[model samples]
Target: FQRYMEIVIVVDHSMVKKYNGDSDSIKAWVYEMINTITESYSYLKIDISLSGLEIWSGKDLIDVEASAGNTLKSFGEWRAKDLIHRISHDNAQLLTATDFDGATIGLAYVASMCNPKRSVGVIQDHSSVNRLVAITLAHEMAHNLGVSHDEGSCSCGGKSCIMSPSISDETIKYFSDCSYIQCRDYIAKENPPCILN
Candidate 1:
């Protein structure tokens, strides 16, 4: 079976500023990050596409200064009201420069992959390395697809798996066996018509 997942990325104004207000550079960077994610998912036979990208070049439409949870709420609200109608995507993710409290870099509703109202995630681009940001996006995307965090049993090249509770350069880019099984189970149970060919 062929499965395709379309994702949209919303770049906040702060993130735009991070790249010195260069929309072209930001767009190229995002495309490169998504490419890494696509490569990671290749073995699963799932294709990840960057369906749309919205750059808040002027200002953030929502209050990004708020907590990550609050920011997600407002972002999702905006997505439901305007962005979703304008873009064709299975899920939308926000990439912000706002530093979330503590070590939390990303958040997404579990098993919300194909849900119109819930299929969105928020992540902070907290690293200088684009690969780290890409990994965080992949992690949040996997969460939306119903993959849970890998317990202590999972391992990848002597490091924790991609779905581990935490990640670093040492972590492999591929999904762990546990996460693959979990995602397969979720797909079988939910039968998300959008993804199946």
Candidate 2:
């Protein structure tokens, strides 16, 4: 059987209230994001399953505690580094929530932990609450898979690329078809043969 990795989304309860968005809407957006990314890998026929995305309300920081036993830390400061170490050793993925300072809507630790093997940790800003759920999720997911920000000038110029930093409505359209070859390439590089036939 093919080994499938699980993605866990840990949301802070206080942050959720601060954003003032419907919980159901947020959950729906997350599902859409997962679907969008997985569909891109349909050629490889690989499946990215969700273990369970839960919200941890009232937590102070975004804790990416490894199910295999690892400590938690803050985001953007020392947390990313610690997570990199765990990812390298554990061979897993995590996405955490954080407060945005405007410039960084999200951040990812791609290959920051694992050496030859690739892994990712995503951090989403609580301030960007207005952003569509799927777009935000897809953007962060793209980063964890080793995709970088493609800072291009024109609109839709880098739509097919999962690494594009800023996402617009136009970019969303591009992803509608799920032609994210770069994302597929990253998956292939990490888990070869693309998809099981």
| TM-score against native, each model | 0.94, 0.56
**TM-score of predicted structure 1:** 0.94
Q: What's the true lDDT of residue 49 in model 2?
A: 64
Residue range 51-82, candidate 2, lDDT tens digits: 56655455545444322122221343433454
Which of the numbered candidates is closest to the native, going by highest lDDT?
1
RMSD of each: 1.4, 7.3
Query: Could you say which candidate leads in TM-score?
Result: 1
Clashing pairs in 2: 13-57, 44-195
The Cα error of candidate 1 at residue 181, in Å, is 0.6
Model 1 collision count: 0
* Candidate 2 Cα outliers beyond 4 Å, as residue runs: 1-3, 19-26, 41-46, 61-99, 112-120, 123-131, 151-161, 173-197
Candidate 1 local lDDT, 22-71, one digit each (tens): 99999888998998899888766689888889999988888885477888
